[PDB]
Amino acid sequence: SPGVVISDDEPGYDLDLFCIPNHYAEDLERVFIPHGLIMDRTERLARDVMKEMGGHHIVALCVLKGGYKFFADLLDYIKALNRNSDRSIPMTVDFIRLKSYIKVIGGDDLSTLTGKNVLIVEDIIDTGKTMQTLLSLVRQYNPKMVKVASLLVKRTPRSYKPDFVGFEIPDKFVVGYALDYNEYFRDLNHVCVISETGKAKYKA
Amino acid sequence: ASPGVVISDDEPGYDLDLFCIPNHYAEDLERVFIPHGLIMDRTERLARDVMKEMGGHHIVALCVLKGGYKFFADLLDYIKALNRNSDRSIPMTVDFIRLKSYIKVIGGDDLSTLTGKNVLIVEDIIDTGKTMQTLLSLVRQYNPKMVKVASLLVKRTPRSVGYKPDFVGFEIPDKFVVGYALDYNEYFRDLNHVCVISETGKAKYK
Amino acid sequence: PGVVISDDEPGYDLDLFCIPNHYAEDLERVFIPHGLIMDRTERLARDVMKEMGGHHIVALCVLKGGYKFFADLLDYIKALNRNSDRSIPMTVDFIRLKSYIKVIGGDDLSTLTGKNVLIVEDIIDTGKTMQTLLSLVRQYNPKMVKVASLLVKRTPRSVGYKPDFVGFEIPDKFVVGYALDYNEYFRDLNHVCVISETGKAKYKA
Amino acid sequence: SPGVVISDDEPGYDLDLFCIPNHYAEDLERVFIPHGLIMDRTERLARDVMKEMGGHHIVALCVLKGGYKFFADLLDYIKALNRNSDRSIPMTVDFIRLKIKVIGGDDLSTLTGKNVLIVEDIIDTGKTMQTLLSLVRQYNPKMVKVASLLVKRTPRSVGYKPDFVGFEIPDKFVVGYALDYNEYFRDLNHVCVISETGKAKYKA
Ligand SMILES: Nc1nc2c(ncn2C[C@H](COCCP(=O)(O)O)COCP(=O)(O)O)c(=O)[nH]1
Ligand SMILES: Nc1nc2c(ncn2C[C@H](COCCP(=O)(O)O)COCP(=O)(O)O)c(=O)[nH]1
Ligand SMILES: Nc1nc2c(ncn2C[C@H](COCCP(=O)(O)O)COCP(=O)(O)O)c(=O)[nH]1
Ligand SMILES: Nc1nc2c(ncn2C[C@H](COCCP(=O)(O)O)COCP(=O)(O)O)c(=O)[nH]1
Numbered sequence A: 001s002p003g004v005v006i007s008d009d010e011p012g013y014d015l016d017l018f019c020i021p022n023h024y025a026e027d028l029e030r031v032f033i034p035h036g037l038i039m040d041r042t043e044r045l046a047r048d049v050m051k052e053m054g055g056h057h058i059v060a061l062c063v064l065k066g067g068y069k070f071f072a073d074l075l076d077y078i079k080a081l082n083r084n085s086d087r088s089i090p091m092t093v094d095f096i097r098l099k100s101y102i103k104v105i106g107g108d109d110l111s112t113l114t115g116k117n118v119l120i121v122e123d124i125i126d127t128g129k130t131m132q133t134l135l136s137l138v139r140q141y142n143p144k145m146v147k148v149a150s151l152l153v154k155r156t157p158r159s160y161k162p163d164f165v166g167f168e169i170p171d172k173f174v175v176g177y178a179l180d181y182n183e184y185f186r187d188l189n190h191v192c193v194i195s196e197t198g199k200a201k202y203k204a
Numbered sequence B: 001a002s003p004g005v006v007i008s009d010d011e012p013g014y015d016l017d018l019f020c021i022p023n024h025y026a027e028d029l030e031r032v033f034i035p036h037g038l039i040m041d042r043t044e045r046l047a048r049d050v051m052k053e054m055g056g057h058h059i060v061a062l063c064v065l066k067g068g069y070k071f072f073a074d075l076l077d078y079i080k081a082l083n084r085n086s087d088r089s090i091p092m093t094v095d096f097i098r099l100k101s102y103i104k105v106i107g108g109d110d111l112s113t114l115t116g117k118n119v120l121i122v123e124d125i126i127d128t129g130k131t132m133q134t135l136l137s138l139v140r141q142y143n144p145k146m147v148k149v150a151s152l153l154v155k156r157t158p159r160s161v162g163y164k165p166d167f168v169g170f171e172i173p174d175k176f177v178v179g180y181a182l183d184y185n186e187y188f189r190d191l192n193h194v195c196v197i198s199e200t201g202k203a204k205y206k
Numbered sequence C: 001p002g003v004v005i006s007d008d009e010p011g012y013d014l015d016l017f018c019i020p021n022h023y024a025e026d027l028e029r030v031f032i033p034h035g036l037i038m039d040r041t042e043r044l045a046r047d048v049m050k051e052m053g054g055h056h057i058v059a060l061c062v063l064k065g066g067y068k069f070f071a072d073l074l075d076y077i078k079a080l081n082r083n084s085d086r087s088i089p090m091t092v093d094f095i096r097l098k099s100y101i102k103v104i105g106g107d108d109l110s111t112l113t114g115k116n117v118l119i120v121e122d123i124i125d126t127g128k129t130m131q132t133l134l135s136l137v138r139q140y141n142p143k144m145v146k147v148a149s150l151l152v153k154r155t156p157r158s159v160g161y162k163p164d165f166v167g168f169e170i171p172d173k174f175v176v177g178y179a180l181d182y183n184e185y186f187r188d189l190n191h192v193c194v195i196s197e198t199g200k201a202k203y204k205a
Numbered sequence D: 001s002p003g004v005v006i007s008d009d010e011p012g013y014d015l016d017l018f019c020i021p022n023h024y025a026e027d028l029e030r031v032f033i034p035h036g037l038i039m040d041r042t043e044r045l046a047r048d049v050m051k052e053m054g055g056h057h058i059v060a061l062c063v064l065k066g067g068y069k070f071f072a073d074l075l076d077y078i079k080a081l082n083r084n085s086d087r088s089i090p091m092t093v094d095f096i097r098l099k100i101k102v103i104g105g106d107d108l109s110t111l112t113g114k115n116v117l118i119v120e121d122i123i124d125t126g127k128t129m130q131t132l133l134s135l136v137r138q139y140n141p142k143m144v145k146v147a148s149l150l151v152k153r154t155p156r157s158v159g160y161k162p163d164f165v166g167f168e169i170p171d172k173f174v175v176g177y178a179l180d181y182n183e184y185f186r187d188l189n190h191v192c193v194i195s196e197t198g199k200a201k202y203k204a
């Protein structure tokens, strides 16, 4: 499954139809994915993750910063399953950053991943090359399995497909739900599209 | 004064496999029409819209059972979230009614409790608008200070008598839907999403 | 037998929580934080399905005080049902109770026959109301009648009835909030709390 | 305020009165602080934070790993305020580890002239925050505040008190809500005390 497919001819939602951060009022164009829809999709993903990555000890890797929201909510939904049903597994967590100029900064020593079920949690897959690099590096420390859950996957001329996908989006730049534009819009609950005012206001 | 979130006749919905669904309704549903989380988001905005307009005086929130109960609880929860985090809040009392076509209200408090009060009527869906017009005609006999109507769903239909509610969640096609307290012969009320029933479902719960 | 709140529990200071602004002078202490109610209700929903999930459940809400507990209990029940391999469909109903007991509103009682009935209440005080309601329900031969009550009081006035599901066992004190009222007020409050003398005078009939 | 005070005699809550992670069934002793209680308290803290820090751009710093849950929940309640009020402020986020040496995170020059909120899971001796504060002040933020879910009552306290406190607890070892015992129990909803069995089970 490619996840929830949002087509190119999606107009999104008018800002005035939802509760939007006041300081971003004139900065956003449309709401592209409402927060509540992300939650419903993530709930289902949590059940698929446990069904696939059970029942050995899971190491959950959060790719900071954009992955932090999806990570926290996904784990919360996984927590809901483990405390309300039989058949569960203990989970440890770790948080990493990926550097360019490929380079894993932060997180524990990668030997912790050895012989374990590693769940990598991403915000978005664009070209897919970043995850290919990370998976190759991770694969050298020999785990039981390694899976990738990405909130977003872009339809675009690019290389990879994650094991768990929330939404398949058009080739547009989106912010919100921890996804950023120059560090901004992480403090936004919905996934949205920036306006021209916003891009110039928070330009680097 | 928005018509709410507009869902067009072209909207196909979502595959059931993309969401978590009641296991006992797996064969009884065709598509997810409005995800539960989308409802909450819209309902959150509606709560702020209601207080902007009705927060000036004491509110009597009137729930139209049974289909209205979920939208009533969630709306009030979001209104309460505002009232315990702002300097501007107003007391609220609640009451529940059931409308039987025999047109006639049933099992409520004395409607004199509406006199001089700001009444918020909460419904699940408005189709022709005849039911609400009737209810309002009865309510206005008791001279409320103000009477407003919040409806989760408003259908686009030529059968409409022209009545428009004050607060609208979603403007939907002229199609039968269930879930979120809306029912098909008392079934699907235990459904969290708003959905379209399958041929298998309507045959089993006929 | 549920979460026991002893007689000497002082509760919580008002300024430590988020409180309805129009009730700021009307409340004394927070007795049961909203989140605690949710946590306890979550477990109760699993206990309900463990005993009653084997057959079609008819859920009866006792208006008005039960409306919050009813909605939240069913939400957790639904959360279970959309994540399990097995579940049974639920139909809901809402009733009000009166004397001269007489069930006001709701469907025909014949809809309860052969079904697993869950009566959802806000509180059990003397228990006389539930004893009477249960005696009426039994007449229509349901498969099973169970009662979920959020609150049970430790009171000498208790006739001796205990519900099958209990959220909290509270002292013999008057509490408001979470759909529980004082002359129709405080239903618009998600914490179970203790009224102040200021509030008791302001809102008295 | 010292926050919600938990006494020394508080026995907590029986395990089978709540929904508990199935794999920690005999590893916990009692539920110390129910998750829902943490939420209500965190909600009030969010309002307190915004009233003191909402006058200017906020940079929220999460002290991984233990602070991650309190961080995400606190920021969510803050977001609820900001999308429902007529006045709010942009917030950027950052994640750090402490080994004073800051492990990971952006250049500390990003804190200059901004309202810095450091988010912790627990204050014990208070040494960790004091040294971090004395370092952060040297980058000249507009202000710097500290929110901690937990503050322990202990004679070896250097006397430091955070600006925002969730709960004041006795000198007991607690786990859950991202707090760990040898990297375990981070996948737990409530704050709890481990049993004798669990303590030996996950012995480092
Ligand atoms: N916030 C946001 N970021 C986007 C978007 N598209 C690509 N990116 C950058 C994606 C993430 O951000 C890059 C730098 P960062 O993680 O330090 O913020 C790139 O994915 C890696 P790959 O699969 O190899 O191309 C987007 O629509 N929104
Ligand atoms: N569950 C469901 N019910 C629908 C739908 N359309 C009309 N109805 C009947 C709804 C009410 O039917 C009466 C039975 P009830 O209120 O006891 O459930 C809407 O009425 C609105 P109006 O035409 O303006 O008087 C629908 O798509 N789903
Ligand atoms: N708000 C509130 N109501 C209380 C309380 N104790 C009894 N009641 C009234 C309870 C309800 O009686 C009438 C109130 P209602 O018509 O609003 O439901 C007593 O429970 C029934 P029983 O077991 O037969 O004694 C209390 O502490 N707070
Ligand atoms: N999980 C847990 N950790 C506890 C506890 N008490 C102190 N700690 C260690 C707290 C953190 O130290 C452990 C290192 P870590 O951040 O890598 O987990 C002490 O707070 C810092 P300070 O105020 O300067 O003394 C506890 O009850 N549970």
Ligand SMILES: [Mg+2]
Pocket: A063, A066, A067, A122, A123, A124
């Ligand atoms: Mg990323």
Ligand SMILES: [Mg+2]
Pocket: B064, B067, B068, B123, B124, B125
């Ligand atoms: Mg209706």
Ligand SMILES: [Mg+2]
Pocket: C062, C065, C066, C121, C122, C123
């Ligand atoms: Mg009652």
Ligand SMILES: [Mg+2]
Pocket: D063, D066, D067, D120, D121, D122
């Ligand atoms: Mg810490």
